[PDB]
Amino acid sequence: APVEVTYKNMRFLITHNPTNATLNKFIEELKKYGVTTIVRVCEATYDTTLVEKEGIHVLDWPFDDGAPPSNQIVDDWLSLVKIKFREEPGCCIAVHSVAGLGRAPVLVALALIEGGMKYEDAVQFIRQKRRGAFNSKQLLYLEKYRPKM
Amino acid sequence: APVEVTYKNMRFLITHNPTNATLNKFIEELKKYGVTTIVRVCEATYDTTLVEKEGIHVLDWPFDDGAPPSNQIVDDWLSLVKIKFREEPGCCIAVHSVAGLGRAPVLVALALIEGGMKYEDAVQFIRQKRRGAFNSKQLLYLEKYRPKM
Amino acid sequence: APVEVTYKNMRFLITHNPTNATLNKFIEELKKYGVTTIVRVCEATYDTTLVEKEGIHVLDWPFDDGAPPSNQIVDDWLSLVKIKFREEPGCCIAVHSVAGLGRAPVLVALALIEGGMKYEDAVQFIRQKRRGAFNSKQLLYLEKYRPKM
């Protein structure tokens, strides 16, 4: 069920929630897509040190389901996006939440928007890859979000 | 097996011609892709009343196999496209013919062109999603087509 | 499964080595993908004549596995590309290598770069369709490439 989104020097892998009892299969896939680091945006359900073990870096920035990400998180997220793909050309950043339909897709959307896409373009571009990518509240949030390249 | 095409605020779903026996599953799939309105461009082989009842709206704009759509159809189709994606950002409009290689992709192409894409680009864009998407007559039609809006 | 890449009026099909001696099905799919020409970049069993007999033009431009293609090859490649897609809009150029992870995607990459994409862009675009499409050498080669302008 791995969802991949590209544009333009950016590449994202939106993924589901793993467990200690399924982390093996989950890492194998990450390694396959050239994932250098993964940003967990939801609640912890497995031990991240196991991932860090295999050479994949981890950043744990969880925020409430449905609710909008803090200013700090959006901030860090964008800093990470801006530098990683430049420092490491062709790499891939995996972001994952529980369902993979709200929180992760939103950070991916804010990245596309900062990259020059209109919000309605960023929403379709993503749903192109993940059927039910956003709920009403989240859509409204993306609609009122103001970028600064 | 449904083909999906998107750019930029637009997002289309080209489906096969369902049947009364598979309609229930056909409707669940549409709902999941976020389709609010479907456009049947071919000869009727199933009853749409059940689709209308499940909340999805049907537009019967059939036109001759191989022959180009009339000005009326082209006009209504482009009108629906411009409006629907405006009214419900992030939604999807389903289009379907019989084989899904001619009439259906032709309307999709026209939308993309008025969307700012050159015909050659639109032809390739759709073929990456639907292998043998056009015949010689349909290609010549799209080449001589003059973008209105 | 077949690795296909589109942009904008260009469309490339990266192929492996025609399985189980039955190049019959290999040719059937090429024709379905609207392939008119095939660029063989490796050197192996492949009844080149059987293919051309079926209607598909074959060009033999083999080069060192891992090493950068010569300037003549890039030259011919680039003209082949510009020519063919203008000549027959909507067609497809197949690129044939051994593993379809190096030599082939590099050429495809050079075409996208010529199309206006920056190398990071072209590297992400292709890996979107083919997981491990480039090795270190190849990535560094594309970083130093400079399109003839």
Closest residue by Cα to residue C62 from C54, C70, C51: C70
A11 contact residues in C (CB cutoff 8 A) = 124, 127-128
**Structural domain of A133:** 1-148
On whether the CB atoms of residues A102 and A69 are closer than 8 A, the answer is no
Pick the residue from chain A with its C-alpha nearest to B9: A121
Q: Among C8, C81, C82, which would you mutate to test the B interface (most chain B Cβ atoms within 10 Å of its Cβ)?
A: C8
Closest partner CB to B127 (pick from C5, C8, C90): C90
Report the Cα–Cα distance between both ends of chain C, in Å, rounded: 36
Three-state SS sequence of chain A: CCEEEECCCCEEEEECCCCCCCHHHHHHHHHHCCEEEEEECCCCCCCHHHHHHCCCEEEECCCCCCCCCCHHHHHHHHHHHHHHHHHCCCCEEEEECCCCCCHHHHHHHHHHHHCCCCHHHHHHHHHCCCCCCCCHHHHHHHHHCCCCC
Closest partner CB to B128 (pick from C6, C85, C89): C6
Q: List, in order, residues 6 or more apart from B114 with CB less than 8 Å away.
A: B78, B81, B147, B148, B149
Q: In what order do the strands lie in the sheet with B57-60?
A: B3-6, B11-15, B92-96, B35-40, B57-60
Task: Find tokens 């159809």 and name the residue.
Answer: B73
Helix and strand counts by DSSP (H, E) for chain B = 6, 5
Q: Which token pair is C143?
A: 């970083």
CATH number at residue B29: 3.90.190.10
On whether the CB atoms of residues B56 and B31 are closer than 8 A, the answer is yes
Q: List, in order, residues 6 or more apart from A6 with CB less than 8 Å away.
A: A12, C124, C125, C127, C128
Resolution attained, angstroms: 2.7
Q: Is the dihedral of CA C64, C65, C68, C71 positive or negative?
A: positive
Q: List, in order, residues 6 or more apart from C58 with CB less than 8 Å away.
A: C37, C38, C39, C40, C48, C51, C52
CB pairs under 8 A between A and C: 38
The whole-angstrom separation of Cα B54 and Cα B30 is: 10
Domain count across chain B? 1
Which helix (H) or strand (E) element contains residue C76?
Answer: helix C71-87
| Beta-bridge partners for A136 | none
By DSSP bridging, strand C3-6 and strand B92-96 are: unpaired
On whether the CB atoms of residues C106 and C123 are closer than 8 A, the answer is no
Give the DSSP letter of residue B82: H
Closest residue by Cα to residue C45 from C101, C96, C93: C96
On whether the CB atoms of residues B27 and B52 are closer than 8 A, the answer is no
The whole-angstrom separation of Cα C3 and Cα C127 is: 10
Q: How far is CA C114 from CA A17, B16, C131, C149, in A?
A: 40, 37, 23, 9
The whole-angstrom separation of Cα A14 and Cα A12 is: 6
On whether the CB atoms of residues A53 and A26 are closer than 8 A, the answer is no
